[PDB]
Amino acid sequence: HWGYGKHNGPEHWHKDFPIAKGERQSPVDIDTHTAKYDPSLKPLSVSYDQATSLRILNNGHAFNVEFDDSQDKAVLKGGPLDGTYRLIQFHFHWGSLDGQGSEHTVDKKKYAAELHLVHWNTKYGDFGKAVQQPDGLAVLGIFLKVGSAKPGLQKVVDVLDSIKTKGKSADFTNFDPRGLLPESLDYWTYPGSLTTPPLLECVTWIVLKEPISVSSEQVLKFRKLNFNGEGEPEELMVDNWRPAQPLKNRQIKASFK
Ligand SMILES: NS(=O)(=O)c1ccc(NC(=O)COc2ccc3c(c2)OC(=O)CC3)cc1
Ligand SMILES: [Zn+2]
């Protein structure tokens, strides 16, 4: 099956998922000089005060913190979006070394990790239908650099021992995702895709300019997770990122001058 190894990694995905060579694939390099300020972009509206986290799962490619998305509780609106997008899960991508790990890059710079807060357009009724639509998802991407610890991430870090291997899950209630945001909501935006199979071209990408700082110990703990299931040779969950894909016929717009 697909993964991030030499024999099943990103260069192989097109054989089972031909859209991997499509016209709006993600991630991309964000060339900050070529991104144009769009004064018609509105501020992002992040309404997470009623978020209800439920569970954390190691799915064999990352860990997902999952939310109750059966009502409008944690929603993203505004920015480039029309309508209301409900938070369903967040996860990260990260490297084996602090110098790599992000999916998006900024002037070819790689951050140590990248957080994806995944939301689906409520006009499509549930997540499975949304991913079949060109405006079905809005993913908020936030870069992680290594420096000072992020206090709001520590609850995530400390449960990872309990989901070391693929298929393990743990209760994860009462987690506040606002503790993962940077101060500024300035962003870049462009039309793209899921960055893992099935690579569907259903995502409005909203990538924040301001990274968050996490400590070396925090990302160290991400790197102790396993891609494999319990009882099967240990493969550390590192470098679970897809590299930048061709921009093709797309413009990245900036919300800020
Ligand atoms: N890296 S990315 O572009 O942000 C990116 C973001 C999101 C995805 N896809 C998903 O999360 C899938 O969600 C699901 C899928 C299946 C089921 C679910 C929830 O619940 C169940 O009942 C069992 C079935 C891929 C990539
Ligand atoms: Zn992701």
Coordinates of all heavy atoms in Angstrom, one line a residue, residues 128-196:
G128 N -17.5 13.0 3.5 CA -17.3 12.1 2.3 C -17.8 12.7 1.0 O -17.3 12.5 -0.1
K129 N -18.9 13.5 1.1 CA -19.4 14.2 0.0 C -18.6 15.4 -0.4 O -18.3 15.7 -1.5 CB -20.9 14.6 0.2 CG -21.9 13.4 0.2 CD -22.1 12.8 -1.2 CE -23.3 13.4 -1.9 NZ -24.5 13.2 -1.1
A130 N -18.1 16.1 0.7 CA -17.3 17.3 0.5 C -16.1 17.1 -0.3 O -15.7 17.9 -1.2 CB -17.0 18.0 1.8
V131 N -15.4 15.9 -0.1 CA -14.1 15.7 -0.8 C -14.3 15.4 -2.3 O -13.4 15.4 -3.0 CB -13.3 14.5 -0.1 CG1 -13.0 14.9 1.3 CG2 -14.0 13.2 -0.2
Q132 N -15.6 15.3 -2.7 CA -15.9 15.1 -4.1 C -16.2 16.4 -4.8 O -16.5 16.4 -6.0 CB -17.1 14.1 -4.2 CG -16.8 12.8 -3.5 CD -18.0 11.9 -3.5 OE1 -18.4 11.4 -2.5 NE2 -18.6 11.7 -4.7
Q133 N -16.0 17.5 -4.1 CA -16.3 18.8 -4.7 C -15.1 19.7 -4.7 O -14.2 19.7 -3.8 CB -17.4 19.5 -3.8 CG -18.5 18.6 -3.3 CD -19.2 18.0 -4.5 OE1 -19.4 18.5 -5.5 NE2 -19.7 16.7 -4.2
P134 N -15.0 20.6 -5.7 CA -13.8 21.5 -5.8 C -13.6 22.5 -4.7 O -12.5 22.9 -4.5 CB -14.0 22.2 -7.2 CG -15.4 22.0 -7.5 CD -15.8 20.7 -6.9
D135 N -14.7 22.8 -4.0 CA -14.8 23.7 -2.9 C -15.2 23.0 -1.7 O -15.9 23.5 -0.8 CB -15.6 25.0 -3.2 CG -17.0 24.7 -3.5 OD1 -17.4 23.5 -3.7 OD2 -17.9 25.6 -3.5
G136 N -14.9 21.7 -1.5 CA -15.4 20.9 -0.4 C -14.7 21.1 0.9 O -15.3 20.9 2.0
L137 N -13.4 21.3 0.9 CA -12.6 21.4 2.1 C -11.9 22.8 2.1 O -11.5 23.4 1.1 CB -11.5 20.4 2.2 CG -12.0 18.9 2.2 CD1 -10.8 18.0 2.6 CD2 -13.1 18.6 3.1
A138 N -11.6 23.2 3.4 CA -10.7 24.3 3.6 C -9.7 23.8 4.6 O -10.1 23.3 5.7 CB -11.4 25.5 4.2
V139 N -8.4 23.7 4.3 CA -7.4 23.3 5.2 C -6.5 24.5 5.6 O -6.0 25.2 4.7 CB -6.5 22.1 4.6 CG1 -5.5 21.7 5.7 CG2 -7.3 20.9 4.2
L140 N -6.5 24.7 6.9 CA -5.6 25.7 7.4 C -4.3 25.1 7.8 O -4.2 24.2 8.7 CB -6.3 26.3 8.7 CG -5.7 27.5 9.4 CD1 -5.5 28.6 8.5 CD2 -6.5 27.8 10.6
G141 N -3.2 25.6 7.1 CA -1.9 25.1 7.3 C -1.1 26.1 8.2 O -1.1 27.3 7.9
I142 N -0.3 25.6 9.1 CA 0.5 26.4 10.0 C 1.9 25.7 10.2 O 2.0 24.5 10.5 CB -0.2 26.4 11.4 CG1 -1.6 27.0 11.3 CG2 0.6 27.3 12.4 CD1 -2.4 27.1 12.6
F143 N 2.9 26.5 9.9 CA 4.2 25.9 10.0 C 4.7 25.9 11.4 O 4.3 26.7 12.2 CB 5.2 26.8 9.2 CG 4.9 26.9 7.7 CD1 4.5 28.0 7.1 CD2 5.0 25.7 6.9 CE1 4.3 28.1 5.7 CE2 4.8 25.8 5.6 CZ 4.4 27.0 5.0
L144 N 5.6 24.9 11.7 CA 6.2 24.7 13.0 C 7.7 24.9 12.8 O 8.3 24.2 11.9 CB 5.9 23.3 13.6 CG 4.6 23.1 14.3 CD1 3.4 23.3 13.3 CD2 4.5 21.7 15.0
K145 N 8.3 25.8 13.6 CA 9.8 25.9 13.7 C 10.2 25.5 15.1 O 9.4 25.6 16.0 CB 10.3 27.3 13.4 CG 9.9 28.4 14.3 CD 10.4 29.7 13.9 CE 10.1 30.8 14.9 NZ 10.6 32.1 14.5
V146 N 11.4 25.0 15.2 CA 11.9 24.5 16.5 C 12.6 25.7 17.2 O 13.5 26.4 16.7 CB 12.9 23.4 16.3 CG1 13.6 23.0 17.6 CG2 12.2 22.2 15.8
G147 N 12.1 25.9 18.4 CA 12.7 27.0 19.3 C 12.1 26.8 20.6 O 12.2 25.8 21.3
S148 N 11.3 27.8 21.1 CA 10.6 27.6 22.4 C 9.4 26.7 22.2 O 8.9 26.5 21.2 CB 10.1 29.0 22.9 OG 9.0 29.5 22.2
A149 N 9.0 26.1 23.4 CA 7.9 25.1 23.4 C 6.6 25.8 23.1 O 6.4 27.0 23.4 CB 7.8 24.4 24.7
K150 N 5.7 25.1 22.5 CA 4.3 25.6 22.4 C 3.5 25.0 23.5 O 3.2 23.8 23.5 CB 3.8 25.2 21.0 CG 2.5 25.9 20.7 CD 2.7 27.4 20.4 CE 1.4 28.0 19.7 NZ 1.6 29.4 19.5
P151 N 3.1 25.8 24.5 CA 2.4 25.2 25.6 C 1.1 24.4 25.2 O 0.9 23.3 25.7 CB 2.0 26.4 26.5 CG 3.1 27.4 26.2 CD 3.3 27.2 24.7
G152 N 0.4 24.9 24.2 CA -0.9 24.3 23.8 C -0.7 23.0 23.1 O -1.7 22.3 22.9
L153 N 0.5 22.7 22.7 CA 0.7 21.4 22.0 C 1.1 20.3 23.0 O 1.0 19.1 22.7 CB 1.9 21.6 21.1 CG 2.3 20.4 20.3 CD1 1.3 19.9 19.4 CD2 3.6 20.7 19.4
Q154 N 1.4 20.6 24.3 CA 2.0 19.6 25.1 C 1.0 18.5 25.4 O 1.4 17.3 25.5 CB 2.5 20.3 26.4 CG 3.4 19.3 27.2 CD 4.6 18.7 26.4 OE1 5.1 19.4 25.6 NE2 4.9 17.5 26.6
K155 N -0.3 18.8 25.5 CA -1.3 17.7 25.8 C -1.3 16.7 24.6 O -1.4 15.5 24.9 CB -2.7 18.3 26.0 CG -2.9 18.9 27.4 CD -2.7 17.8 28.5 CE -3.4 18.2 29.8 NZ -3.3 17.1 30.8
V156 N -1.0 17.2 23.4 CA -0.9 16.2 22.3 C 0.3 15.4 22.4 O 0.3 14.2 22.4 CB -0.9 17.0 20.9 CG1 -0.6 16.0 19.8 CG2 -2.2 17.8 20.8
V157 N 1.5 16.1 22.7 CA 2.7 15.3 22.8 C 2.6 14.3 23.9 O 3.2 13.2 23.7 CB 3.9 16.3 23.2 CG1 5.1 15.6 23.7 CG2 4.2 17.2 21.9
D158 N 1.9 14.5 25.0 CA 2.0 13.6 26.1 C 1.1 12.4 26.0 O 1.3 11.4 26.7 CB 1.8 14.3 27.5 CG 3.0 15.1 27.9 OD1 4.1 14.6 27.9 OD2 2.8 16.3 28.2
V159 N 0.2 12.3 25.0 CA -0.7 11.2 24.8 C 0.0 10.2 23.8 O -0.5 9.1 23.6 CB -2.1 11.6 24.4 CG1 -2.1 12.0 22.9 CG2 -3.1 10.6 24.7
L160 N 1.0 10.7 23.1 CA 1.5 9.9 21.9 C 2.1 8.5 22.3 O 2.0 7.6 21.5 CB 2.6 10.7 21.2 CG 2.1 12.0 20.5 CD1 3.3 12.6 19.8 CD2 0.9 11.8 19.6
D161 N 2.6 8.4 23.6 CA 3.0 7.1 24.0 C 1.9 6.1 24.0 O 2.2 4.9 23.8 CB 3.5 7.2 25.5 CG 4.9 7.7 25.6 OD1 5.6 7.7 24.6 OD2 5.3 8.0 26.7
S162 N 0.6 6.5 24.1 CA -0.5 5.6 24.1 C -1.0 5.2 22.7 O -1.9 4.4 22.6 CB -1.6 6.2 25.0 OG -2.3 7.3 24.4
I163 N -0.5 5.9 21.7 CA -0.9 5.6 20.3 C 0.3 5.3 19.4 O 0.4 5.8 18.3 CB -1.9 6.6 19.7 CG1 -1.2 8.0 19.7 CG2 -3.2 6.6 20.5 CD1 -1.8 9.0 18.7
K164 N 1.3 4.6 19.9 CA 2.6 4.5 19.3 C 2.4 3.9 17.9 O 3.2 4.3 17.0 CB 3.5 3.6 20.1 CG 4.9 3.5 19.5 CD 5.8 2.7 20.4 CE 7.2 2.6 19.8 NZ 8.1 1.8 20.7
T165 N 1.5 2.9 17.7 CA 1.5 2.1 16.5 C 0.2 2.3 15.8 O -0.9 2.7 16.3 CB 1.7 0.6 16.8 OG1 0.8 0.2 17.9 CG2 3.1 0.4 17.2
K166 N 0.2 1.9 14.5 CA -0.9 2.1 13.6 C -2.1 1.4 14.1 O -2.1 0.2 14.5 CB -0.5 1.4 12.2 CG -1.6 1.5 11.1 CD -1.1 0.8 9.9 CE -2.0 1.1 8.7 NZ -1.8 0.1 7.6
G167 N -3.3 2.1 14.1 CA -4.6 1.5 14.5 C -4.9 1.8 16.0 O -6.0 1.6 16.4
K168 N -3.9 2.3 16.8 CA -4.2 2.6 18.2 C -4.9 4.0 18.2 O -4.5 4.9 17.5 CB -2.9 2.6 19.0 CG -2.3 1.2 19.1 CD -3.1 0.3 19.9 CE -2.3 -0.9 20.4 NZ -1.0 -0.5 20.9
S169 N -5.8 4.1 19.2 CA -6.5 5.4 19.4 C -6.7 5.5 21.0 O -6.5 4.6 21.7 CB -7.9 5.4 18.8 OG -8.7 4.4 19.3
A170 N -6.9 6.8 21.4 CA -7.1 7.1 22.8 C -8.1 8.2 22.9 O -8.2 9.1 22.0 CB -5.7 7.6 23.4
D171 N -8.9 8.2 23.9 CA -9.8 9.3 24.2 C -8.9 10.6 24.3 O -7.8 10.6 24.8 CB -10.5 9.1 25.5 CG -11.4 7.8 25.4 OD1 -12.2 7.7 24.5 OD2 -11.4 7.0 26.4
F172 N -9.5 11.7 23.7 CA -8.8 13.0 23.7 C -9.8 14.1 23.7 O -10.0 14.8 22.8 CB -7.8 13.0 22.5 CG -6.7 14.0 22.6 CD1 -5.7 13.8 23.5 CD2 -6.7 15.2 21.9 CE1 -4.7 14.7 23.7 CE2 -5.7 16.1 22.0 CZ -4.7 15.9 22.9
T173 N -10.5 14.2 24.8 CA -11.6 15.1 25.0 C -11.0 16.4 25.5 O -10.0 16.5 26.2 CB -12.7 14.6 25.9 OG1 -12.1 14.2 27.2 CG2 -13.4 13.4 25.2
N174 N -11.8 17.5 25.3 CA -11.5 18.8 25.9 C -10.2 19.4 25.5 O -9.5 20.1 26.3 CB -11.6 18.7 27.4 CG -12.9 18.1 27.9 OD1 -13.0 17.0 28.3 ND2 -14.0 18.9 27.8
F175 N -9.7 19.2 24.3 CA -8.5 19.8 23.8 C -8.9 21.1 23.0 O -9.8 21.0 22.2 CB -7.7 18.9 22.8 CG -6.5 19.6 22.3 CD1 -5.4 19.7 23.2 CD2 -6.5 20.1 21.1 CE1 -4.2 20.3 22.7 CE2 -5.3 20.7 20.6 CZ -4.2 20.9 21.4
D176 N -8.2 22.2 23.3 CA -8.6 23.4 22.7 C -7.6 23.8 21.6 O -6.5 24.1 21.8 CB -8.5 24.6 23.8 CG -9.0 25.9 23.3 OD1 -9.2 26.0 22.0 OD2 -9.4 26.7 24.1
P177 N -8.1 23.7 20.3 CA -7.1 23.9 19.2 C -6.7 25.4 19.1 O -5.8 25.6 18.3 CB -7.9 23.4 18.0 CG -9.4 23.6 18.4 CD -9.4 23.3 19.9
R178 N -7.3 26.3 19.8 CA -6.9 27.7 19.7 C -5.5 27.9 20.2 O -4.8 28.8 19.9 CB -7.8 28.6 20.5 CG -9.2 28.7 19.9 CD -10.1 29.5 20.7 NE -10.5 28.9 21.9 CZ -11.4 29.3 22.8 NH1 -12.1 30.3 22.5 NH2 -11.6 28.6 23.9
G179 N -5.0 26.9 21.1 CA -3.7 27.0 21.6 C -2.6 26.6 20.6 O -1.4 26.6 21.0
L180 N -3.0 26.2 19.4 CA -2.0 25.9 18.4 C -1.8 27.0 17.3 O -1.1 26.8 16.4 CB -2.5 24.6 17.6 CG -2.5 23.4 18.6 CD1 -3.1 22.2 17.8 CD2 -1.2 23.1 19.3
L181 N -2.6 28.2 17.5 CA -2.6 29.2 16.5 C -1.5 30.2 16.8 O -1.2 30.5 18.0 CB -3.9 29.9 16.4 CG -5.1 29.1 16.2 CD1 -6.4 29.9 16.2 CD2 -5.0 28.3 14.9
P182 N -0.9 30.9 15.8 CA 0.0 32.0 16.0 C -0.8 33.2 16.3 O -2.0 33.2 16.2 CB 0.8 32.0 14.7 CG -0.2 31.7 13.7 CD -1.0 30.6 14.3
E183 N -0.1 34.3 16.6 CA -0.7 35.6 16.9 C -1.5 36.1 15.7 O -2.6 36.5 15.8 CB 0.4 36.6 17.3 CG 1.0 36.4 18.6 CD 1.9 37.5 19.0 OE1 2.1 38.4 18.2 OE2 2.5 37.5 20.1
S184 N -0.8 36.1 14.5 CA -1.4 36.7 13.3 C -2.1 35.7 12.5 O -1.7 34.5 12.4 CB -0.3 37.3 12.5 OG -0.8 37.9 11.2
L185 N -3.2 36.1 11.8 CA -3.9 35.3 10.9 C -3.7 35.7 9.4 O -4.5 35.4 8.6 CB -5.4 35.3 11.3 CG -5.8 34.6 12.6 CD1 -7.3 34.6 12.8 CD2 -5.2 33.2 12.7
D186 N -2.6 36.4 9.2 CA -2.2 36.7 7.8 C -2.0 35.4 7.1 O -1.4 34.5 7.6 CB -1.0 37.6 7.7 CG -1.2 39.1 8.2 OD1 -2.4 39.5 8.3 OD2 -0.2 39.7 8.4
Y187 N -2.4 35.4 5.8 CA -2.3 34.1 5.1 C -2.0 34.2 3.6 O -2.2 35.3 3.0 CB -3.6 33.3 5.3 CG -4.8 34.0 4.7 CD1 -5.2 33.8 3.4 CD2 -5.6 34.9 5.5 CE1 -6.3 34.4 2.9 CE2 -6.7 35.5 5.0 CZ -7.1 35.3 3.7 OH -8.1 36.0 3.1
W188 N -1.6 33.1 3.0 CA -1.6 32.9 1.6 C -2.7 31.9 1.3 O -3.1 31.0 2.1 CB -0.3 32.3 1.1 CG 0.9 33.2 1.3 CD1 1.2 34.3 0.6 CD2 1.9 33.0 2.2 NE1 2.4 34.8 1.0 CE2 2.9 34.0 2.1 CE3 2.2 32.0 3.3 CZ2 4.0 34.1 2.8 CZ3 3.3 32.2 4.0 CH2 4.2 33.2 3.8
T189 N -3.3 31.9 0.1 CA -4.4 31.0 -0.3 C -4.3 30.6 -1.8 O -3.9 31.5 -2.6 CB -5.7 31.6 0.1 OG1 -6.8 30.6 -0.2 CG2 -6.1 32.8 -0.7
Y190 N -4.6 29.4 -2.1 CA -4.6 28.9 -3.4 C -5.4 27.6 -3.5 O -5.6 27.0 -2.5 CB -3.2 28.6 -3.9 CG -2.6 27.4 -3.4 CD1 -2.6 26.2 -4.1 CD2 -2.0 27.3 -2.1 CE1 -2.1 25.0 -3.5 CE2 -1.5 26.2 -1.6 CZ -1.5 25.0 -2.3 OH -1.1 23.8 -1.8
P191 N -5.9 27.3 -4.7 CA -6.7 26.0 -4.8 C -5.8 24.8 -5.0 O -4.9 24.9 -5.8 CB -7.5 26.3 -6.1 CG -6.6 27.2 -6.9 CD -5.9 28.1 -5.9
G192 N -6.0 23.8 -4.2 CA -5.2 22.6 -4.2 C -5.9 21.3 -3.9 O -7.1 21.2 -4.2
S193 N -5.2 20.4 -3.3 CA -5.6 19.1 -3.0 C -5.3 18.5 -1.7 O -4.5 19.1 -0.9 CB -5.0 18.1 -4.1 OG -3.6 17.9 -3.8
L194 N -5.8 17.4 -1.3 CA -5.3 16.5 -0.3 C -3.9 16.2 -0.6 O -3.6 16.0 -1.8 CB -6.1 15.2 -0.1 CG -7.6 15.3 0.0 CD1 -8.2 13.9 0.1 CD2 -8.1 16.2 1.1
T195 N -3.0 16.2 0.4 CA -1.6 15.9 0.1 C -1.3 14.4 0.4 O -0.1 14.1 0.3 CB -0.7 16.8 1.1 OG1 -0.9 16.3 2.4 CG2 -1.0 18.2 0.9
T196 N -2.2 13.6 0.7 CA -2.1 12.1 0.8 C -3.1 11.5 -0.1 O -4.2 12.1 -0.3 CB -2.2 11.5 2.2 OG1 -3.5 11.9 2.7 CG2 -1.1 12.0 3.1

